[PDB]
Write a protein that binds this DNA or RNA. Sequence first.
DNA 1: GCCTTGCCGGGTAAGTTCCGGCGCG
DNA 2: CGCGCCGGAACTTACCCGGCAAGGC
Length: 177
Amino acid sequence: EEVSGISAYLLGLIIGDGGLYKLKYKGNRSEYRVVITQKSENLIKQHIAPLMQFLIDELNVKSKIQIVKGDTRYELRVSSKKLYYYFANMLERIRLFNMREQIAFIKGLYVAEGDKTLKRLRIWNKNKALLEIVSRWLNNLGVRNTIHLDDHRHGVYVLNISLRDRIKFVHTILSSH
DNA sequence: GCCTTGCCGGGTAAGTTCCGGCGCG
DNA sequence: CGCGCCGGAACTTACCCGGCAAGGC
Ligand SMILES: [Mn+2]
Ligand SMILES: [Mn+2]
Ligand SMILES: [Mn+2]
Ligand SMILES: [Mn+2]
């Protein structure tokens, strides 16, 4: 209930600004990574990490939250086969998210990939199918929107939330838990 | 004249996967 | 022997930002 909401939010940040990596090292070593990157140190240590910690505690993951400071950004990383599959399986069943999870995930995805000036309401991603899934959710919530190829340099698509529904958007999705 | 939204270029804030560790049965 | 958790960081580019303008009222 509370776990899955926080889960879908985190999944949003992950699919947005991180990822789920199954790596094969020399040899034959392996690792399973749950990753969120961000520039803001504060956002990652004060906001995201306590949420990942709760989820880790709640699923008995003996793994730790790593925070690696690279040149351009902070990488929050959990190295854990268990947490990995947890999100990956949730991702596999994304089309089945209930209302709480939908709002949670879109919130997460907006923080990552969204227009922060909020003068325009936009979401970027190369994954058209992902954006399409999000678009259908927004329609069932009374938030009109269109999708179209924004950046031909890189095949990045954009999801544009109609300014007509700005307030229904900002207070239903972004101003939640 | 004003509001909404598609267009399009700048470049940095993201993402992705190497490496060397260490530990487990 | 095969595999799973740490600590990095080099490397590439996919996101965001923001000015412009083409319609719609
Ligand atoms: Mn992304
Ligand atoms: Mn991003
Ligand atoms: Mn981002
Ligand atoms: Mn086009």
